[PDB]
Amino acid sequence: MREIVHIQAGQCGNQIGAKFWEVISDEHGIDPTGSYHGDSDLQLERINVYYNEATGNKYVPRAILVDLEPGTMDSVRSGPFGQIFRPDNFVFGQSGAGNNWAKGHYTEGAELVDSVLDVVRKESESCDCLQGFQLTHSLGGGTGSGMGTLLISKIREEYPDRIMNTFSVMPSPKVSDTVVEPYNATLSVHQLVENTDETYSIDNEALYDICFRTLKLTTPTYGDLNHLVSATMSGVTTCLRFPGQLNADLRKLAVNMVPFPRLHFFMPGFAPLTSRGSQQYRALTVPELTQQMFDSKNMMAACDPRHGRYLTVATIFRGRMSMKEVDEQMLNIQNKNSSYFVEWIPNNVKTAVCDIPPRGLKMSSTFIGNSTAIQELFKRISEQFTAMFRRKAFLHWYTGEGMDEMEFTEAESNMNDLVSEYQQYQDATAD
Amino acid sequence: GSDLGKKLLEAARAGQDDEVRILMANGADVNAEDDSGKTPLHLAAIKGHLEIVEVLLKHGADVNAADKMGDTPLHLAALYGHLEIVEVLLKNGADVNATDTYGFTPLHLAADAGHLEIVEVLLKYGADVNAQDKFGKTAFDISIDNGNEDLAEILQKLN
Amino acid sequence: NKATSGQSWEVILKPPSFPSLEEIQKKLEAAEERRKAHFAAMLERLQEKDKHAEEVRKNKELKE
Amino acid sequence: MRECISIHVGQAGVQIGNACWELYCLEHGIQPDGQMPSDKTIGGGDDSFNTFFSETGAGKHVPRAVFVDLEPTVIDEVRTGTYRQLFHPEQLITGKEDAANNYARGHYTIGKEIIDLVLDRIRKLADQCTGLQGFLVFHSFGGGTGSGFTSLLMERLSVDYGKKSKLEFSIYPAPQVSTAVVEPYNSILTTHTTLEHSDCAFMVDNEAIYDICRRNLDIERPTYTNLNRLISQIVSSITASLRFDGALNVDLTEFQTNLVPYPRIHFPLATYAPVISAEKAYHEQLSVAEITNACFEPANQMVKCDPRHGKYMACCLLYRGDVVPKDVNAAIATIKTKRSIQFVDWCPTGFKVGINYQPPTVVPGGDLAKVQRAVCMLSNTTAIAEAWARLDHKFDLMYAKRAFVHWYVGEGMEEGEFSEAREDMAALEKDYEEVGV
Numbered sequence A: 001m002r003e004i005v006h007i008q009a010g011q012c013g014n015q016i017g018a019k020f021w022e023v024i025s026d027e028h029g030i031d032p033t034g035s036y037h038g039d040s041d042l043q044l045e046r047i048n049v050y051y052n053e054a055t056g057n058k059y060v061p062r063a064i065l066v067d068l069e070p071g072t073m074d075s076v077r078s079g080p081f082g083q084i085f086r087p088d089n090f091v092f093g094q095s096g097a098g099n100n101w102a103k104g105h106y107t108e109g110a111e112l113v114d115s116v117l118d119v120v121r122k123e124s125e126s127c128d129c130l131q132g133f134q135l136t137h138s139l140g141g142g143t144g145s146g147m148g149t150l151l152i153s154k155i156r157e158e159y160p161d162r163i164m165n166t167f168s169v170m171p172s173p174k175v176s177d178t179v180v181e182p183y184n185a186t187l188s189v190h191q192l193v194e195n196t197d198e199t200y201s202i203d204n205e206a207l208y209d210i211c212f213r214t215l216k217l218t219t220p221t222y223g224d225l226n227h228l229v230s231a232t233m234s235g236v237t238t239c240l241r242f243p244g245q246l247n248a249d250l251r252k253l254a255v256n257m258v259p260f261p262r263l264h265f266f267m268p269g270f271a272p273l274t275s276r277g278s279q280q281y282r283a284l285t286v287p288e289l290t291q292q293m294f295d296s297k298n299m300m301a302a303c304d305p306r307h308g309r310y311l312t313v314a315t316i317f318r319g320r321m322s323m324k325e326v327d328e329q330m331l332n333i334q335n336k337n338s339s340y341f342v343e344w345i346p347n348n349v350k351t352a353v354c355d356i357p358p359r360g361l362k363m364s365s366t367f368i369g370n371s372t373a374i375q376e377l378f379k380r381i382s383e384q385f386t387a388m389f390r391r392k393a394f395l396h397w398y399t400g401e402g403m404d405e406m407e408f409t410e411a412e413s414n415m416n417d418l419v420s421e422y423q424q425y426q427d428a429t430a431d
Numbered sequence B: 001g002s003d004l005g006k007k008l009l010e011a012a013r014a015g016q017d018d019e020v021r022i023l024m025a026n027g028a029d030v031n032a033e034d035d036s037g038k039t040p041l042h043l044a045a046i047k048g049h050l051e052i053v054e055v056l057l058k059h060g061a062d063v064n065a066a067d068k069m070g071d072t073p074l075h076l077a078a079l080y081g082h083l084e085i086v087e088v089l090l091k092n093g094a095d096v097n098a099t100d101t102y103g104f105t106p107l108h109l110a111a112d113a114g115h116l117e118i119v120e121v122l123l124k125y126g127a128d129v130n131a132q133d134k135f136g137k138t139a140f141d142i143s144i145d146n147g148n149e150d151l152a153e154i155l156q157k158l159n
Numbered sequence C: 001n002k003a004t005s006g007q008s009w010e011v012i013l014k015p016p017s018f019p020s021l022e023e024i025q026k027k028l029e030a031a032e033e034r035r036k037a038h039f040a041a042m043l044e045r046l047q048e049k050d051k052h053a054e055e056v057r058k059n060k061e062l063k064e
Numbered sequence D: 001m002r003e004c005i006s007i008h009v010g011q012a013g014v015q016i017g018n019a020c021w022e023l024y025c026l027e028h029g030i031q032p033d034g035q036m037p038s039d040k041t042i043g044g045g046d047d048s049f050n051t052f053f054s055e056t057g058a059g060k061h062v063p064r065a066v067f068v069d070l071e072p073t074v075i076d077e078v079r080t081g082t083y084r085q086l087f088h089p090e091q092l093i094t095g096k097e098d099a100a101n102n103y104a105r106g107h108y109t110i111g112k113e114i115i116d117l118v119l120d121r122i123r124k125l126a127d128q129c130t131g132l133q134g135f136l137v138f139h140s141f142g143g144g145t146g147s148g149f150t151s152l153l154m155e156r157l158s159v160d161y162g163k164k165s166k167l168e169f170s171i172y173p174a175p176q177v178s179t180a181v182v183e184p185y186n187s188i189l190t191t192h193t194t195l196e197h198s199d200c201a202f203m204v205d206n207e208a209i210y211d212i213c214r215r216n217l218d219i220e221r222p223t224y225t226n227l228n229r230l231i232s233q234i235v236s237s238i239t240a241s242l243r244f245d246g247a248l249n250v251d252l253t254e255f256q257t258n259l260v261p262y263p264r265i266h267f268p269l270a271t272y273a274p275v276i277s278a279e280k281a282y283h284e285q286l287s288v289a290e291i292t293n294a295c296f297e298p299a300n301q302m303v304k305c306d307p308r309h310g311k312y313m314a315c316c317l318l319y320r321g322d323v324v325p326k327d328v329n330a331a332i333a334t335i336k337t338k339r340s341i342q343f344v345d346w347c348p349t350g351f352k353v354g355i356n357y358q359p360p361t362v363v364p365g366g367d368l369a370k371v372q373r374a375v376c377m378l379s380n381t382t383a384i385a386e387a388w389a390r391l392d393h394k395f396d397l398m399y400a401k402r403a404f405v406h407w408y409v410g411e412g413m414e415e416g417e418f419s420e421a422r423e424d425m426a427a428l429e430k431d432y433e434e435v436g437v
């Protein structure tokens, strides 16, 4: 453990990735030029996990930016922190994926993949001790989805002993109108079940619902959704980038979170929920942070945790607070809600407290749950997939790329087995 | 139509039936276009909001209004599988054979989506089965390439 | 017993009533050969998918 | 002669080692640079502290210790800290990648890469010994290095140092401070593999220490620094007799003779008293009777268990400071009248008593008050089986579902090893039950 290699694929992946880099640079005291201007040795202790130190006291993200479309790369370079990235790390095609998983995975993606692997190999071989990889992408499009999963498989081939981690954005008809999103997401989930060690399920259905219902934003934009994604990504990576005892690296996190290989889809939670530029009046208390953290309304995946059972939970508290109060509040939740935590995994809730709060807040809490309720996300995608597949809708766009109908049948079957497996552990008893 | 135009589009996308009515009375423009050229009628047609479609039409909405991709509300309801909306637009003068920037007719889109009942209503209303999109595909070709046996039988009778 | 920096005694309250090194190498050998066989099976299954993606690409040319 | 090599494995082992060596230095008057005005330069190399500290030509005292970790951060603190001059760089060994709380990874994957280097450094320390007694091994049960690397090391040490004594100071897991859900798996896997290689093991239950810190030291949320300072006091009580001219537990073999009647039942229970807060108002010092009584109170134990639900097979009382035999004997007599100190049929009902005149020592700005007299009772009771039962139950809950098993199997471990380890624990619980039935 030390270095993490970050990969950003497609429009969503690059937008969410760029936001992650600007948020974490601010936390680590790094400005858009790569210079450290912070005021705390804690900010630099584990800087090497995400940044390479270049000549002249500059810090460079260990990030690879990928797209089959050039426009997104221009948007990244033009962004606030756009100048911090390594120019040789931008790997882009000229003809997009046209929101087609098959084009991203087999055709256009395959044509670009080796150029990407050459850049990831250069970053990986420069590592003193590589933890693994972190990929940001959507499952609904063509590049992030198809090419992103192709990259995962190609990387798994060359680095079989490293951890593969993803921030996978799940499609929703509430935010996108592309009819093929159920096909692209099911084909990707099939790949993720087999090839990743840990996946953060970032659901556009839940992000939209939070913005509309809680934040009272009549017309949520990707900027509003991405404000919730970046808060979450900062929270779930806190333990990796600051000194601490719990889930300090990708493997220790996986060992604590993943009891069965296929069951590696996490339901992230965050408190307090805020809107871009909302003037947050008074910091929350520890009982308020704990109550909200397990609340369905604070979940970044559109699943009710009360509809399932927690296999494992990681809770991260940020800011200056009593560790005694956190311990009491955390024990109270488990004792009161005993039935929503599997009895056959003792002490399955792990808590960490980081003194450094995120930007704009004095106190915050991040929840990472491995809940059997995530089956609701997969069932929603499966039902949308089946409605289309049963009518043989839009199939020619996929088969036209050389794919067979059987791949669709197989992907659907694998996702339904995953749902069945969650249900099996939901019903299992310590007997 | 300023504040009212954006508010009317929001209410037709959300299916806020009573908020659409309140905005019409206040003078919101029925054909107020969005970023993509979509009128409140295209949004009601995508999302499946039958009553909104009917209130918009009674308040003189443009049934054949084309967005920036050249899709009318009939192309959208046909793609999204809203049979009852496809029947309402047709009865109110929707262009069965309207063509977008890609050469797609509503039949092209219903065949690709596999909407059997929509294809039947489109053919009943005079959809041309010999129309070719910019890919050189008829709706029969679309069903054969998709592997759709039931739909290719439904279209072969004319083609 | 009286030592320089210490003292000791007993208090009896009551009487009673009335080279394996080669095997270590063999066990570590087995685990290593099993871990490699696990990794090699993951690799064959990914090498299997690579063949399928080259098959998909050759099928694309059969259309246009 | 008669040297003891201390081996600190993983974070818990290294951190407890820091606390122990800091305390030893205060006890012997050794400064953090290795200098001591009390000694003579060889000389000068025959006083009891020499069993734990070697001497250099510059008159410096060097711990006969090796610190090992599969990751560098914890040991990096030792090589940059207050005692950086106390240890030579070669005795601080680190890898790059840790065992990720996985016994299989610590034992089979990563451990295999550093084992020869560790044995080479241990061998260089042993080469400086004329009468090596054996090893004191400090490690956690829960971590992948503490569990996996320790058992690998213990096996090799039995090969390289034949009939040489090996004692353990093992950190038993507590959820209040636990970092891994898999700690019960690692605990049972290490106990099974180390069992035939360890002669005597002193378990330290993190919850017992956590509770003593909260109750006796008034610490709201105890940290590893608080836990370790308290742990070091008990370790110092146990090792005082090796490092000073004792009379009881004079050598490593004597711990076995005095506390272990059967090789498998080798887990003595340590009970320490008094544990008093430094930030407290002037109070009258506890008598020999009061501290002896405190030895039979479950609240003062290093492992949570009930001796009233078990039987004693050996009992050692290690007094320190202003202690007179007359007061000890009177205290033992009164205890039998108020307490059920039931021994097994085959063992005599009694105590082996040792007074070490050296005063109890505390770290200056620490949590513990300096006392005139203290005592550590080491007893081999069947009640300690309760700690194995709690661990075995947590193992069984997860194992019935094969939860997390894929992590060990992926490192080359066989599922049958989990069964073998668990059956050995079931035989151990059966041994405790059968002994004193």
Ligand SMILES: Nc1nc2c(ncn2[C@@H]2O[C@H](COP(=O)(O)OP(=O)(O)OP(=O)(O)O)[C@@H](O)[C@H]2O)c(=O)[nH]1
Binding pocket: D009, D010, D011, D012, D013, D015, D016, D069, D070, D098, D099, D100, D101, D102, D106, D140, D141, D142, D143, D144, D145, D146, D147, D171, D172, D173, D174, D177, D178, D179, D183, D206, D224, D225, D227, D228, D231
């Ligand atoms: N008392 C005490 N317990 C500790 C300390 N550090 C860790 N532990 C406990 O030991 C267990 C974790 O094992 P570690 O020693 O940290 O792990 P490790 O041996 O370094 O192994 P890996 O990190 O997995 O390679 C948990 O039960 C912790 O509570 C310490 O300084 N003191």
Ligand SMILES: Nc1nc2c(ncn2[C@@H]2O[C@H](COP(=O)(O)OP(=O)(O)O)[C@@H](O)[C@H]2O)c(=O)[nH]1
Binding pocket: A009, A010, A011, A012, A013, A015, A016, A097, A098, A099, A137, A138, A139, A140, A141, A142, A143, A144, A145, A169, A170, A171, A172, A175, A176, A181, A204, A207, A222, A223, A225, A226, A229
């Ligand atoms: N949360 C979020 N979702 C996005 C963003 N951009 C696109 N999406 C979603 O991503 C999916 C479309 O995939 P996209 O990444 O744009 O296509 P790609 O460029 O082919 O990978 C849909 O579900 C969109 O709603 C963004 O900035 N944030």
Ligand SMILES: [Mg+2]
Binding pocket: D010, D011, D071, D098, D143, D145
């Ligand atoms: Mg460690």
